[PDB]
Amino acid sequence: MENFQKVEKIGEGTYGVVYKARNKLTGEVVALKKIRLPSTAIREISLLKELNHPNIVKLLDVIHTENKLYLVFEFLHQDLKKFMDASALTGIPLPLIKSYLFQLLQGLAFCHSHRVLHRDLKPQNLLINTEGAIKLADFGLARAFGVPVRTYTHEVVTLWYRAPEILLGCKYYSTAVDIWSLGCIFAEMVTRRALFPGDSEIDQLFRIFRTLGTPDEVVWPGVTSMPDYKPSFPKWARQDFSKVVPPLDEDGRSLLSQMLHYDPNKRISAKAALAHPFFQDVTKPVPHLRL
Ligand SMILES: Cn1cc(NC(=O)c2cc(-c3ccccc3)nc3ccnn23)cn1
């Protein structure tokens, strides 16, 4: 932190402070993330420097010096959480929602093709720029560092986007967990409200069940044998997506339903989702960004 001049706190991320900083040698403005605390993690994280795609926030460097771990990322000026808050009177226009979803699916398809999962997608790690791009930040890190209940400064890590197999204690994640999260985000962009804003693991799980119906062996073979499944769960009926995400059209609702299948083996893949009729008329609009 002397071969970075000018260093400012951006926010508090899942693993430590995030700073905006200028690289000394190069003049470039970067995001610098301090990871608060392991050699297995270093090689794993290091591999992510090769995982480069236009819809993935570039990992520029892994700095392991002075027994500290810093990740240096490409810097973007706004996140989707802030953008949706700024867009709340009018909503994000459907063509821009569509562009963002399509781009995010391209990013997921890339990473999934290389056997890399995110596992903690949320609006705060989706970053936007002035050119209409959106990018996924922090891919691959959960496999390396875990996902805590609370961050270094005691902020509660959100459960809102967590897939039901994770909440039911399945110990092997698949790429389907990212599709679920993205489906949740899609619904939130459309309705301007989080889809499942749980404030505890059971509240999260029951909010899912009260919308999508309590899962059973018909819709999710194997569910009743999951580690944290209890036969005493209340049995709620499923709601129609026409009630959950109006005014989304039938193409959008169909796609959302497939992203929110209970059984992770039934849930649509990113690559398949890109071929969905919802994207037949996709475009790349310019967002209105105030920086
Ligand atoms: C991995 N990675 C993170 C980023 N950037 C961000 O996190 C980021 C930074 C800032 C920011 C605001 C005022 C002054 C300085 C910075 N505002 C937002 C709003 C949303 N994100 N964000 C770039 N790369």
Author numbering: 1 to 37, 45 to 298
Question: What does the published report state?
Answer:
To further demonstrate biological relevance, each pool of four or five compounds was screened against a representative protein target (cyclin dependent kinase 2, CDK2) by SPR at three concentrations (2.5, 20, and 200 μM). The kinase domain has been structurally well characterized with the orthosteric ATP-binding pocket sitting between the N- and C-lobes in which many small molecule hits have been shown to bind. Other allosteric binding sites have also been identified with small molecule and fragment screening at sites with potential biological relevance in the development of inhibitors with allosteric modes of action.
Thirteen screening pools from the library were identified as potential hits, having Rmax between 31 and 102 RU and KD values for the pool between 87 and 270 μM. For example, pool 9h–l had a projected KD and Rmax of 112 μM and 98.7 RU, respectively. 11 of the 13 triaged pools were taken into crystallographic soaking experiments with the exemplar protein CDK2. A positive hit was identified in crystallographic experiments from compound pool 9h–l. The compound containing the methylpyrazole carboxamide substituent (9k) was the only compound to match the electron density of the 2Fo – Fc map. Analysis of the X-ray structure showed that this compound shows a novel pharmacophore, with the methylpyrazole group embedded toward the back of the orthosteric pocket forming a hydrogen bond network with the backbones of Glu-81 and Leu-83 and π-stacking with Tyr-19. The NH of the amide linker interacts with the hinge via the carbonyl of Leu-83, with the expected acceptor interaction with the hinge instead forming between Asn-3 and a nitrogen in the phenylpyrazolo[1,5-α]pyrimidine ring. The phenylpyrazolo[1,5-α]pyrimidine interacts with the backbone carbonyl of His-84 and NH of Asp-86 resulting in rotation of this core scaffold relative to the methylpyrazole, orientating the phenyl ring toward the top of the opening to interact with the side chain of Glu-8 via van der Waals forces. Reduced density, however, was observed for the phenyl group most likely due to its positioning at the opening of the pocket where it is solvent exposed. Eleven of these were taken into crystallographic soaking experiments, resulting in the elucidation of a novel hit for CDK2.
